[PDB]
Design a protein around this ligand. Structure first.
Ligand code: CLA
Ligand code: CLA
Ligand code: CLA
Ligand code: CLA
Ligand code: CLA
Ligand code: CLA
Ligand code: CLA
Ligand SMILES: CC1=C(/C=C/C(C)=C/C=C/C(C)=C/C=C/C=C(C)/C=C/C=C(C)/C=C/C2=C(C)CCCC2(C)C)C(C)(C)CCC1
Ligand SMILES: CC1=C(/C=C/C(C)=C/C=C/C(C)=C/C=C/C=C(C)/C=C/C=C(C)/C=C/C2=C(C)CCCC2(C)C)C(C)(C)CCC1
Ligand SMILES: CC1=C(/C=C/C(C)=C/C=C/C(C)=C/C=C/C=C(C)/C=C/C=C(C)/C=C/C2=C(C)CCCC2(C)C)C(C)(C)CCC1
Ligand SMILES: CC1=C(/C=C/C(C)=C/C=C/C(C)=C/C=C/C=C(C)/C=C/C=C(C)/C=C/C2=C(C)CCCC2(C)C)C(C)(C)CCC1
Ligand code: SF4
Ligand code: SF4
Lengths: 135, 81, 31, 150, 39, 150
């Protein structure tokens, strides 16, 4: 249970972010330095645990991408989605450091490996509601 | 949300996967070219319409496209309220 | 010359034939 | 020192958490407990229909004519009627997210329900008419102070 | 005036005001209907 | 195609099962849900006491005298009073077969109970008085349109 030293703001959690969804992020920072938050604010972190609560799936990933690993090199942060019931989802990290290309075999659902020169057509595909993929 | 469209011209530089801030891509194992792992969209439901991804695609006639649908929601519209 | 209660008459021809005829021709297509 | 977390989009400025203001806001008929929605409607109607007739009483296009009192009366009558209409239909279509945004430390009351809203609208109608007539009576005898002449 | 009756005196307001009123009221309550029925 | 059996003494004629009519009958204050018996009484009183004063207002034996307005008012006052008396005593002796004959697809409401009937009668009384006075006010200034002269 560690949260950074801040003086309060006016752009935090809203009537949706506790009736629909919650976002949380946490890592291990063995140092304390000043940082910037996307809702605006220049504050200091603390040793080890660094827990933070937020509402968007953009502030969190911005912190994770640009701030932690590109500046502070910290790479042990969980990002957690939360349902209204209080239960949590673990989307990412799913590959350790989010490299997004390394694995020994990967998932397989859906494929389209075809060029565009032979495209779907209006008058040929009709009287139904399928999309540009099924040939 | 919106629909994603993949092609064969993926060289495999993987600049798009490092550009999309919405976690809708992954390089699934391929065989054809030297890539061996081609990009694809497993998690479309978080698509945003920023399409910063193909701007990161260097391939001639960039290998990814996004067909911008019509079934938008609070997730696809991206509201904090 | 001009008219009388006969205009209440020409009003009376409406609201049964044209009125509910148009009403049905509207509600046919499942609001 | 925020309400529950200093990172939430709220601030402890001494205008939304001053003891004076919280006492003054809690005991309003919109929140003060120990009453029925009926009385709430009655009182709100009383107040509003008691002040919402001057703004056009001597201001209407009939401002200086010798009748404008009852003119403003009829005007505010229609006004409160259509206001009741509005709130009633709002209740009719009311129940997506059947809540009200809460910032007062406690929930306001069980006033938050459809039939509650309907009864509230009825009491609003009654109290509004009442405030209207009583203001019209206060204003009726222009000599209301001239007889006193004080 | 002419040989007709009062009618053009007061038949505009209801068409001008109240019929639009019920129109829009019914319309609004229509655009919020439950499933799968609606009138 | 009868309601449940073509041999029952009921028929599917397009006057008792037309969508228009069923919508128009369901939402009446006698059946529309989401309300209290109180409001039901209020509204029925409003309506009836608002129209049940003309039928003798200018029709009574004092038809053309210069007072008949308040005369009709007093008449309809006594009328609604005795009507409330009647319904109240009916409630007093009410509970053999404590139901109402149901033909609307659903049961109407829990309005079918003694104390419910009593509260309904009270609301009827209030709304009837109200409709009476408001109609008397509409009719009070014979010049109600003469000031408009439209
Ligand atoms: C020449 C004029 C004209 C005509 C013949 C129609 C005819 C029609 N309109 Mg329509 N409409 C018009 C002008 C017209 N419209 C205008 C000016 C607007 C506003 C821009 C609309 C907006 C509109 C909407 C929003 C809808 C229709 C619908 C309909 C259909 C069913 C109407 C219904 O249920 O009756 C109702 C009539 C009464 C209750 C009376 C019908 C084909 C409906 C439709 O096609 O749904 C599939 C529908 O939902 N109309
Ligand atoms: C003139 C003498 C006097 C003095 C010295 C005080 C002193 C005080 N009053 Mg006070 N008060 C007075 C007369 C006085 N009262 C009268 C005559 C009334 C009208 C009933 C009030 C109504 C009043 C209210 C409604 C409140 C105070 C409050 C206060 C306190 C803070 C006031 C402040 O900083 O602003 C303080 C103890 C406040 C308090 O105690 O809480 C902050 C507060 O909420 N006063
Ligand atoms: C935006 C500023 C503004 C202001 C201050 C006023 C003020 C006024 N208007 Mg007015 N008016 C305005 C804009 C404005 N109007 C516009 C944009 C239009 C559309 C053309 C009109 C059309 C209009 C008409 C047709 C009439 C007035 C009337 C009036 C007077 C009655 C006051 C009243 O009922 O308020 C009520 C306030 C509350 C209930 C609060 C008042 C002096 C009436 C009047 O006295 O004649 C001049 C009148 O008959 N106004
Ligand atoms: C001839 C039929 C009839 C009559 C005379 C009334 C008369 C009345 N209704 Mg009403 N009503 C009716 C049918 C009728 N209703 C139907 C079929 C519905 C279902 C949609 C309603 C739904 C309804 C609501 C929701 C409310 C009224 C209200 C009222 C009162 C306000 C005055 C007014 O013009 O209301 C306007 C009448 C209509 C728009 C119709 C009045 C006593 C109001 C009331 O009593 O306030 C507490 C109110 O809030 N009515
Ligand atoms: C359907 C097309 C149509 C349109 C756009 C108009 C347009 C108009 N009519 Mg109208 N009218 C029409 C058909 C139409 N008429 C028909 C077929 C009849 C025969 C029943 C009438 C009988 C009629 C009368 C008796 C009056 C109007 C009046 C009017 C004017 C005010 C609107 C109003 O209250 O009308 C009401 C619309 C209907 C009754 C329909 C306006 C110029 C009024 C007028 O002349 O202004 C002073 C008026 O008093 N109309
Ligand atoms: C034969 C009996 C009778 C009589 C004499 C009246 C008399 C009247 N009714 Mg009435 N009415 C009656 C039966 C009767 N009603 C019945 C059985 C119903 C069905 C419920 C109605 C429904 C009804 C409605 C819906 C309205 C009236 C209104 C009016 C007034 C007419 C205003 C006028 O021309 O200037 C004065 C005329 C006379 C004194 C005569 C008048 C007091 C209107 C009203 O109240 O004004 C808004 C109105 O809107 N009446
Ligand atoms: C076409 C429908 C219609 C009708 C019948 C009325 C009728 C009326 N309006 Mg009105 N109004 C309308 C549309 C309408 N309005 C629209 C569309 C607007 C602009 C959005 C306004 C803006 C408006 C203002 C700003 C004011 C009125 C006022 C009035 C009243 C003045 C008395 C009068 O007109 O002469 C009938 C009476 C005699 C001849 C005597 C009257 C009840 C005035 C009033 O008294 O309101 C309280 C006033 O101040 N109206
Ligand atoms: C009985 C009587 C009376 C009364 C009457 C009346 C009052 C009438 C009414 C009238 C009316 C009541 C009329 C109306 C008209 C109608 C019309 C004119 C309609 C039309 C419509 C239409 C044309 C529509 C169209 C459409 C649309 C718009 C949309 C879509 C759908 C459709 C297409 C359908 C009197 C007293 C006089 C006399 C004695 C007896
Ligand atoms: C609380 C309160 C209140 C309030 C109430 C409420 C909240 C209500 C509101 C409500 C409202 C105020 C509403 C309104 C609405 C509106 C509307 C409803 C609109 C209209 C629309 C239209 C007009 C339509 C259109 C259309 C369509 C849709 C289709 C086609 C056709 C047309 C185009 C026509 C009061 C003041 C009383 C008092 C105090 C307390
Ligand atoms: C100062 C001030 C203010 C203001 C306030 C005011 C000024 C208030 C008012 C006061 C008052 C002083 C008023 C009120 C009054 C009211 C009244 C007084 C009413 C009454 C009415 C009634 C109660 C009615 C009843 C009835 C009915 C409902 C029905 C039948 C008939 C009868 C009549 C029984 C403020 C807030 C800004 C704050 C600051 C300071
Ligand atoms: C719903 C309603 C209503 C109704 C109500 C009711 C339902 C009521 C009923 C009531 C009734 C319907 C009653 C009746 C009664 C009657 C009577 C009760 C009669 C009398 C009798 C007699 C007179 C007796 C005889 C005798 C004997 C038995 C013994 C010996 C001696 C002598 C001979 C005396 C109203 C309109 C209000 C309003 C609206 C709603
Ligand atoms: S689409 Fe672009 S970034 Fe993605 S694998 Fe192909 S070449 Fe690399
Ligand atoms: S807009 Fe482009 S980068 Fe963003 S989620 Fe959709 S495909 Fe990915």
């Amino acid at each position: 249970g560690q949260t950074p030293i801040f003086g309060g703001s006016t752009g935090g959690l809203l009537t949706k972010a506790f009736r629909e969804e919650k976002y949380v992020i946490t890592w291990t920072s063995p140092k304390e330095q000043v940082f910037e938050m996307p809702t605006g604010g220049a504050a200091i972190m603390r040793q080890g645990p660094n827990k933070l609560e937020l509402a968007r799936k953009e502030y969190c990933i911005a912190l994770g991408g640009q701030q932690l690993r590109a500046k502070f090199r910290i790479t042990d942060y969980k990002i957690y989605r939360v349902y209204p019931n209080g239960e949590v989802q673990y989307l990412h990290p799913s590959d350790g450091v989010f490299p997004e290309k390394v694995n020994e075999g990967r998932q397989k659902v859906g494929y389209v490996d075809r060029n565009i020169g032979k495209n779907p057509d209006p008058a040929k595909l009709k009287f139904s509601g399928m999309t540009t993929y099924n040939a | 949300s919106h629909s994603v469209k993949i092609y064969d011209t993926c060289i495999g530089c993987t600049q798009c996967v490092r550009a999309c801030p919405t976690d809708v891509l992954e390089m699934v194992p391929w065989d054809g070219c030297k890539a061996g792992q081609i990009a694809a969209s497993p998690r479309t439901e978080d698509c945003v319409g920023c399409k910063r991804c193909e701007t990161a695609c260097p391939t001639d006639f960039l290998s990814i496209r996004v067909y911008l649908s019509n079934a938008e929601t609070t997730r696809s519209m991206g509201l904090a309220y | 010359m001009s008219i009388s209660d006969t205009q209440v008459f020409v009003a009376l021809v409406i609201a049964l034939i044209p009125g509910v005829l148009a009403f049905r021709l509207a509600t046919e297509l499942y609001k | 020192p925020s309400r529950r977390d200093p990172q939430i989009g709220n601030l402890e400025t001494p205008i939304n958490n001053s003891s004076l203001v919280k006492w003054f806001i809690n005991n309003l008929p919109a929140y003060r407990p120990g009453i029925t929605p009926l009385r709430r409607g009655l009182e709100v109607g009383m107040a509003h229909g008691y002040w919402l007739l001057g703004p056009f009483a001597k201001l209407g296009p009939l401002r200086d004519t010798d009748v404008a009192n009852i003119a403003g009366l009829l005007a505010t009558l229609g006004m409160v009627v259509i206001s009741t209409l509005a709130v009633s239909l709002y209740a009719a279509t009311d129940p997506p997210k059947p809540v009200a945004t809460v910032t007062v430390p406690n929930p306001p009351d069980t006033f938050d329900t459809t039939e509650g809203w309907n009864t509230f609208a009825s009491g609003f109608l009654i109290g509004g008419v009442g405030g209207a007539v009583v203001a019209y009576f206060i204003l009726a005898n222009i000599e209301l102070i001239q007889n006193i002449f004080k | 005036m002419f040989s007709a009756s009062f009618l053009p005196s007061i038949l505009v307001p209801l068409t001008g005001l109240v019929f639009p009123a019920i129109a829009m009221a019914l319309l609004l309550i229509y655009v919020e209907r439950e499933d799968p029925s609606g009138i």
